[PDB]
Amino acid sequence: GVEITEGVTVTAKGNTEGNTADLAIDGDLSTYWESSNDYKWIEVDLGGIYELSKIEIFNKDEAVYKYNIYASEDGENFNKIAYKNNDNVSDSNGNMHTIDNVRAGKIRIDVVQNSNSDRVNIAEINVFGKNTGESLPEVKKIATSNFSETPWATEYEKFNSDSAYANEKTLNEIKNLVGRVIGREFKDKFIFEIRDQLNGNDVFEVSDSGDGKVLIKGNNGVSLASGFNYYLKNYCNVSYNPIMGSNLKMPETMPSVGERVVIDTPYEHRYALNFCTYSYTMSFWDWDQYEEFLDWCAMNGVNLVLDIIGQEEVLRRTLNEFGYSDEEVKEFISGPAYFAWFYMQNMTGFGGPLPNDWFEQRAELGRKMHDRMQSFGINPVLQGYSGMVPRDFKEKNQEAQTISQGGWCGFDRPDMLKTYVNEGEADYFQKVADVFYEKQKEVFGDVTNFYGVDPFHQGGNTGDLDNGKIYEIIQNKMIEHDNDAVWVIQNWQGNPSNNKLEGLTKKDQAMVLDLFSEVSPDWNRLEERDLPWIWNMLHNFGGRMGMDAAPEKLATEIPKALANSEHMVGIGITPQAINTNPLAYELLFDMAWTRDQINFRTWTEDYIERRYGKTNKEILEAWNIILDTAYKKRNDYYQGAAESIINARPGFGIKSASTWGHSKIVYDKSEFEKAIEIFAKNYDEFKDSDAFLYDFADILKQLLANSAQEYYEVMCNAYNNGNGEKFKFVSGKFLELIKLQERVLSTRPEFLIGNWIEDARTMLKDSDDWTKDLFEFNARALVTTWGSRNNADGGGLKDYSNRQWSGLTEDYYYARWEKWINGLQAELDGGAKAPNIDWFKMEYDWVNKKSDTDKLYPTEASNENLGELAKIAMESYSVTNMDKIL
Numbered sequence: 001g002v003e004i005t006e007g008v009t010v011t012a013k014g015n016t017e018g019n020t021a022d023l024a025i026d027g028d029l030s031t032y033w034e035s036s037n038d039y040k041w042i043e044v045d046l047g048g049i050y051e052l053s054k055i056e057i058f059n060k061d062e063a064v065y066k067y068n069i070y071a072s073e074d075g076e077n078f079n080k081i082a083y084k085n086n087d088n089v090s091d092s093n094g095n096m097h098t099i100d101n102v103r104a105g106k107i108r109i110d111v112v113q114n115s116n117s118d119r120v121n122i123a124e125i126n127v128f129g130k131n132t133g134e135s136l137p138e139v140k141k142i143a144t145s146n147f148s149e150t151p152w153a154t155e156y157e158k159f160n161s162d163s164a165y166a167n168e169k170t171l172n173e174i175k176n177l178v179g180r181v182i183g184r185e186f187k188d189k190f191i192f193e194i195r196d197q198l199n200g201n202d203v204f205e206v207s208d209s210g211d212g213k214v215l216i217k218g219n220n221g222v223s224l225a226s227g228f229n230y231y232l233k234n235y236c237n238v239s240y241n242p243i244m245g246s247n248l249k250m251p252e253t254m255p256s257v258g259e260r261v262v263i264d265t266p267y268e269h270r271y272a273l274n275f276c277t278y279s280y281t282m283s284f285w286d287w288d289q290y291e292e293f294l295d296w297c298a299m300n301g302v303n304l305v306l307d308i309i310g311q312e313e314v315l316r317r318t319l320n321e322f323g324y325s326d327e328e329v330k331e332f333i334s335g336p337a338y339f340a341w342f343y344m345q346n347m348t349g350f351g352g353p354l355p356n357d358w359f360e361q362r363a364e365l366g367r368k369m370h371d372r373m374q375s376f377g378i379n380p381v382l383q384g385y386s387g388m389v390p391r392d393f394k395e396k397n398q399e400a401q402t403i404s405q406g407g408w409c410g411f412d413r414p415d416m417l418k419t420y421v422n423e424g425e426a427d428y429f430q431k432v433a434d435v436f437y438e439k440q441k442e443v444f445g446d447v448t449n450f451y452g453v454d455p456f457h458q459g460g461n462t463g464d465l466d467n468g469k470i471y472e473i474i475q476n477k478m479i480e481h482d483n484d485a486v487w488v489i490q491n492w493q494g495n496p497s498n499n500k501l502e503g504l505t506k507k508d509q510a511m512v513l514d515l516f517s518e519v520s521p522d523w524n525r526l527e528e529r530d531l532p533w534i535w536n537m538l539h540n541f542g543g544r545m546g547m548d549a550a551p552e553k554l555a556t557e558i559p560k561a562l563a564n565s566e567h568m569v570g571i572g573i574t575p576q577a578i579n580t581n582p583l584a585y586e587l588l589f590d591m592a593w594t595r596d597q598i599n600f601r602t603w604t605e606d607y608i609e610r611r612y613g614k615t616n617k618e619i620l621e622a623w624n625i626i627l628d629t630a631y632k633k634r635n636d637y638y639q640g641a642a643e644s645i646i647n648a649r650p651g652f653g654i655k656s657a658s659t660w661g662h663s664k665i666v667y668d669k670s671e672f673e674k675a676i677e678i679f680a681k682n683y684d685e686f687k688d689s690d691a692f693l694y695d696f697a698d699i700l701k702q703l704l705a706n707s708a709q710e711y712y713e714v715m716c717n718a719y720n721n722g723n724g725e726k727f728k729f730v731s732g733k734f735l736e737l738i739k740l741q742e743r744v745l746s747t748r749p750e751f752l753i754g755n756w757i758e759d760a761r762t763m764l765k766d767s768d769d770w771t772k773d774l775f776e777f778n779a780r781a782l783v784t785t786w787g788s789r790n791n792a793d794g795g796g797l798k799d800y801s802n803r804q805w806s807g808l809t810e811d812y813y814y815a816r817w818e819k820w821i822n823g824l825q826a827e828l829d830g831g832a833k834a835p836n837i838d839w840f841k842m843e844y845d846w847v848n849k850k851s852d853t854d855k856l857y858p859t860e861a862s863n864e865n866l867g868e869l870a871k872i873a874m875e876s877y878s879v880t881n882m883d884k885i886l
């Protein structure tokens, strides 16, 4: 005691009709709050700060509920104070939770599971404790600085206006990059010089200084970084890729250049990133990871990079002028793992709300990025505005005209303002657009001429409006705010249609990304309309893993495209994640620096030598086998790497793990196994190359995915033939195969689910338990169910971002197969028919577990020996030995 029976109030962010929040605290067990959306929590204010001793919870029925309870004494920080994760049914006695005398003015109760429904409920909640006689403080309003008032503005302007200062900054930064990439002791081995463009093209030079130093010139920072990279790769046998394995072992003495080299690129732009990349890869990155990424960008010639960092603050300021409180803005914006689909106008809300201190921190990170990009000569692509507004925009602005955009994968898309209206009507597109571009400037300053926005992406609705006219007016509005604007536009699945693209009256002030040029190029219709366009390798969908690359097409189609066009202004990468197949990315960026087709085989021979720090005939043999199998040219349409059956919801007739995926392996499996035999034979000699280990894990996990598919077919045959004993034996081998795969995956830091989760939980400074748990939810959901039931199932997103990852394989993929197998076994053995499994409910149970109360996944890779694991795989879980094995 004592029960807090006066002054208690409650809020929620959704409820089913009649089942309002206040019904959780009305003293009546027959009335309840019940959730209507993904906000499955309520917030109770106690009318003062109490030292809490007990919290009692009643539900409306006898289902099994799981929930987490949080408390705040300062009004800002909600820390976790109790939870129920046991499988006990609720009953008429309620659940009583002992609280260790925690001070609290407000509590949050998040009900993350109801065994009986997707909706959750609370019939009553009682809180017991001792009044402190104190009151919560007022919560400080969100406040950020204007760019113009920060030291960032001073520096940005000083760089702009003082050549000498700017040159010194660029040259010092490139020296810093050498230090970060190969070590501080190499900084004094290079001399860097700015030069002019060659014939209007970016250019670098590499030569000997005369006293044993390396003289590298370039027209800007990116060119200088590319020259540094060229020297490493061609003279030092060194290869940098901070995400996908490097060989950074330098020679004992700096090798001589010999004949001076001058190398230019005919491309104005070399472009990087997909909106999706910001979610499947970068969601939880800190500055250190961004810095490393930008160094790798500059070294690979990249000078145009999609940038959404801190855009939440831009949108907050914009909507604040159109009747939205900061709380309402936070409900509209997604969580940290969903910004890709938030900014592509596909979804709102989900994974949020973001913490109040998000906005300042992210605006600061964005400013820091623009400072580094400015030093290098990298253009960010910031945001264009095309009419995106929340669905209640007219409620708050009654003269606005809007077009409902309908649904995307079960989410509600935001509305779109009518891009033009009749004489006599208010034009909110003009009004909001003017505020948006002005607020973007207040937050970041004038950092670029490139802006990206993509109305009608993967659906939406043009209403009564003329397609060309919509594009004309959006383009005109962008140009009004930046006379030198270039509207960067994604070309995907025929959006924007020719009639839309013909609306762009200023063709030189648009630039279309041909998104998927290495599989389904679609630049002819751009070229024919005289639109500047960029040739892009997409390659990676969802972060889905496997050996997959198109090196022959990259070595040939790119210079062919250049030879056969007048408006190809660049090449680039548009991957949905940067986690796989380093060969593809290195080759793509190498193709910027030639006008000629090259030989992709000899290119690979040189590539693997610098990647491993050594080579021999057998390693070269194994890579020729990879080029002839997994990396062999394909002429069909497919999205990402062939999917592992291990990662699919269990069932019969499986042909993909994700809706738009494919599991068909188009090469000979036993032939591919030979590459693994060759790597095992050479393991001891190459184990001191981390990049060799990286590649060996990739090909080995590919072998096991490949053989798992064959064992799956045999297992399904055994069930269909009513052979219980054979099914037990074969399904048994299938599960053991997954266990071996888990040992393979354990060997790489890049494969640990624990790193992804820990990054999410630690990405901000000083965040409360509430925010950590919510960010962990974002991390777990994105790689599994993606959204909730109507998104995963009816919406098609289940396992879209499936990862061949350690921890995730044991507790999620393995657990699904085991469950399906056991049900089939029980039936074959004479038991009841195998039950339907509700996959989403089982999957979601995993999504909602927390690292601090359930299981903490490790952040350290194992010492398993990939050579020995490969021998076990060849001997006991292979396609080659399958007849012998089964």
Ligand SMILES: CC(=O)N[C@H]1[C@@H](O[C@@H]2[C@H](O)[C@@H](O)[C@H](O)O[C@@H]2CO)O[C@H](CO)[C@@H](O)[C@@H]1O
Residues within 6 Å of the ligand: 274, 276, 341, 344, 409, 458, 492, 493, 515, 541, 542, 576, 639, 660, 797, 800
């Ligand atoms: C969920 C996701 O990352 N979607 C991507 C993806 O779209 C999916 C698929 O590739 C399309 O063929 C299908 O029409 O829609 C799918 C679900 O959105 O690819 C595109 C292209 O990069 C992305 O824009 C989506 O965001």
Ligand SMILES: [Ca+2]
Residues within 6 Å of the ligand: 023, 024, 025, 026, 027, 028, 029, 030, 031, 032, 033, 122, 123, 124
């Ligand atoms: Ca009640």
